Amino acid sequence: GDETKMQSLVGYVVLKDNERAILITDTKAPGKEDYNLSEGQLMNKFKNNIVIVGLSEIDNTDDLKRGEKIKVWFHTRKESNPPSATIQKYELL
Structure with a gap:
């Protein structure tokens, strides 16, 4: 068994x-x-x-602002165009 692998x-x-x-x-x-x-x-x-x-x-998403470059983590993409996903975490780059 291994840890849950999230996409980013x-x-x-x-x-x-x-x-x-x-x-x-x-x-x-x-x-x-x-x-x-x-x-x-x-x-x-x-x-x-x-x-x-x-x-x-x-x-809390107060620091998620327009112009920020971020990395997001999620389990899967929804079947949509554009793709969409519910994210579990983000990091400001």
Whole structure:
């Protein structure tokens, strides 16, 4: 038997509300003006480079802010486009 292996991914926080955050996962960090785009516009510009992270399981997300680069941990991705996952932990990079 071995320890529970969790998945992880890195991305930049572009939108954050009390229930979820939208992360961009392109190599380069989003440009300053990408932070005035709507969710619909982000979906178009960063197609296949977006992840939605559900924050219901995190005790406090006050420090999870737009512009932060983070690593998130989760068990599995939901069957969605963009992919989405309920995260168990995050780390500010």
